[PDB]
Amino acid sequence: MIAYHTLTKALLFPDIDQYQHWHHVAPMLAKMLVDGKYSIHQQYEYLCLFAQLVAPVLGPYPSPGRDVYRCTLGGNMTVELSQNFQRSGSTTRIAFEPVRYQASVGHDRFNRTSVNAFFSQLQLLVKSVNIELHHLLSEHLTLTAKDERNLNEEYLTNFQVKTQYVVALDLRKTGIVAKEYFFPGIKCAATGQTGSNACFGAIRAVDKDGHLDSLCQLIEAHFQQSKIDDAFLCCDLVDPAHTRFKVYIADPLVTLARAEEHWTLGGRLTDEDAAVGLEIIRGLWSELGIIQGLLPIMLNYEMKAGQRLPKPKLYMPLTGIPETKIARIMTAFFQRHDMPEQAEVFMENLQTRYQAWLSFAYTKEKGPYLSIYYFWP
Ligand SMILES: Cc1nccc2c1[nH]c1ccccc12
């Protein structure tokens, strides 16, 4: 927290909205950089990079009753913070929808320009960021001008917001990596397309050599057998030949049996890593006691050029679970899986935050891969 109080004494914020976003997000971000064992230098580097690069693209501060373009990151904000736990270490991640005030006053109805503004700044501070996939995929997964012509005023009453892009800055200790989330819900409300046809069609359009055709077919076959539609997509803002594509689903059937069905793609994933992860999920689910504005379960399946099979990850809704028990269960989990550093922090804070989701992935290369997504008060 010292790094937040320090930069507060030295940062000049151009408007009241960047100022309010800083005193809202930076204190929690400071505590997560400390808990993640970030060197004091990278604590100042990432807090200042948040104020310089991220706070301008957060739009007007969404005070109670303010008529602004809204988002649901962290439940009610344009910015959401999550922490990742694995044996190699804890890393913080910031996720946000780039937005400028014009979207709140009728000069960018579907908020298509601010992601381009933000990328033009981000690429000046992080030279490794590559936005080629943003140019290739935006046409396939967002509302184009043509789609806007064929679109009626008759998605929002069930999904609430007009969001189509979300950027995630994974604050790795070796350097930031950026990821982009495309939400084709609005594009599909105009073309009548399904989420799967949009996302899987987008991956096949980019993968012109068909490296990922085997992996999309396996996931697609499960989706129509399970009768589930793809929700959205994600990419790594890197060279398009070395990126990881992820397809997400949300399932209002929150049962362990359903999550186990999705985790294995209906039995199509039979490798050893999926079996071990399946085992750990059953324990974690039963340990936490996931209960049956109802949050569903979510999963994504990752595709890379060299990989022969997709790789699942499950998102468990931590609603209704006492925060003391998530702490009690996570501490014991890190202890029993050789993560004494993460077990130590949770043990020290077993001694005001709101944990909303716990995600799980597994390779025995890197061990258990878990993330906690927090919501703003
Ligand atoms: C920032 C963001 N973008 C896309 C998807 C998700 C997200 N945060 C999440 C938390 C739990 C489950 C899914 C998501």
Side-chain angles (χ1 to χ4, degrees), residues 1-153 155-159 161-229 231-271 273-324 326-377:
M1 269 293 276
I2 176 71
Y4 155 77
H5 297 291
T6 294
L7 290 172
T8 300
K9 273 142 70 173
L11 284 171
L12 255 176
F13 286 103
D15 53 80
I16 193 163
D17 292 314
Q18 304 194 16
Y19 172 90
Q20 283 175 314
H21 277 119
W22 158 264
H23 294 295
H24 180 100
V25 181
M28 179 159 309
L29 173 62
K31 305 172 202 233
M32 281 177 307
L33 294 181
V34 175
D35 294 354
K37 300 307 166 289
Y38 281 89
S39 78
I40 189 57
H41 308 302
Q42 277 187 352
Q43 296 180 36
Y44 280 104
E45 178 184 353
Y46 289 150
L47 282 161
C48 185
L49 189 139
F50 162 73
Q52 289 280 281
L53 193 79
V54 181
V57 311
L58 291 190
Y61 190 71
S63 52
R66 212 190 172 158
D67 182 24
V68 290
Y69 181 109
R70 294 232 170 220
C71 190
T72 65
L73 294 192
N76 55 359
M77 301 274 300
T78 39
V79 52
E80 151 189 289
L81 289 158
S82 63
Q83 195 146 30
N84 184 81
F85 308 95
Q86 64 176 298
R87 204 169 291 122
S88 65
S90 285
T91 71
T92 309
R93 191 209 59 167
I94 326 180
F96 47 90
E97 179 196 9
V99 61
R100 294 178 295 194
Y101 77 93
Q102 276 87 355
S104 322
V105 293
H107 296 267
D108 198 359
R109 203 207 180 190
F110 294 112
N111 190 32
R112 299 180 248 207
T113 56
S114 319
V115 64
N116 294 304
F118 167 79
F119 281 165
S120 68
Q121 296 283 73
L122 163 68
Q123 287 191 285
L124 301 165
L125 281 189
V126 196
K127 311 274 181 274
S128 49
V129 168
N130 186 330
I131 66 172
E132 287 173 40
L133 289 158
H134 169 73
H135 297 162
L136 288 182
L137 289 169
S138 210
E139 146 200 29
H140 303 300
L141 307 164
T142 57
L143 194 79
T144 77
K146 176 201 226 165
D147 304 328
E148 194 172 5
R149 294 192 283 267
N150 321 137
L151 170 89
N152 40 347
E153 298 295 281
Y155 180 81
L156 295 197
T157 325
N158 304 354
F159 294 78
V161 296
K162 286 184 280 177
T163 305
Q164 285 187 111
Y165 304 98
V166 161
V167 173
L169 298 179
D170 191 47
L171 305 184
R172 286 175 188 177
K173 288 168 171 59
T174 54
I176 289 176
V177 290
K179 309 202 295 135
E180 196 181 0
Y181 303 85
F182 309 81
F183 299 90
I186 305 202
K187 183 196 187 67
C188 287
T191 68
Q193 215 175 4
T194 61
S196 309
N197 274 327
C199 310
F200 289 109
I203 298 186
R204 294 189 166 97
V206 167
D207 180 32
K208 304 183 241 293
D209 284 352
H211 301 276
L212 305 179
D213 193 58
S214 292
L215 298 89
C216 302
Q217 284 179 338
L218 214 77
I219 299 162
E220 255 168 335
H222 170 73
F223 281 4
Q224 40 214 6
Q225 169 160 351
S226 175
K227 291 211 258 181
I228 182 83
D229 192 26
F232 53 93
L233 176 142
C234 168
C235 78
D236 295 316
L237 298 182
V238 296
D239 188 291
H242 312 323
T243 189
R244 295 170 322 168
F245 291 105
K246 301 185 180 181
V247 197
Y248 289 66
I249 58 164
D251 205 321
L253 187 55
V254 51
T255 73
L256 174 56
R258 189 65 170 164
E260 294 185 37
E261 179 186 359
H262 288 315
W263 174 265
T264 57
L265 282 178
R268 298 164 176 88
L269 296 181
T270 59
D271 53 79
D273 275 352
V276 180
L278 178 55
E279 187 185 329
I280 297 158
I281 277 152
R282 304 203 37 192
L284 261 171
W285 185 294
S286 323
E287 282 168 66
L288 296 163
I290 313 298
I291 318 183
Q292 206 291 125
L294 298 67
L295 276 190
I297 55 174
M298 296 187 46
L299 284 96
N300 76 72
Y301 307 89
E302 173 194 296
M303 290 165 263
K304 208 170 181 301
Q307 293 333 84
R308 293 201 249 251
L309 291 175
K311 183 183 165 301
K313 170 185 303 185
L314 162 75
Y315 298 76
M316 287 162 273
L318 302 181
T319 166
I321 308 184
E323 307 292 332
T324 324
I326 312 166
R328 197 176 324 271
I329 297 309
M330 289 327 291
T331 305
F333 181 85
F334 302 136
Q335 276 165 344
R336 300 188 265 93
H337 275 92
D338 191 39
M339 296 160 69
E341 193 126 19
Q342 291 91 350
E344 201 196 320
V345 195
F346 268 95
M347 192 76 256
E348 192 98 48
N349 279 288
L350 242 193
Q351 172 137 18
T352 298
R353 230 139 69 176
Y354 309 88
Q355 305 159 107
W357 295 75
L358 173 72
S359 65
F360 176 87
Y362 183 91
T363 85
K364 54 96 179 164
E365 174 154 37
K366 314 261 213 131
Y369 185 97
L370 296 86
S371 286
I372 297 194
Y373 299 80
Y374 309 87
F375 272 11
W376 294 108

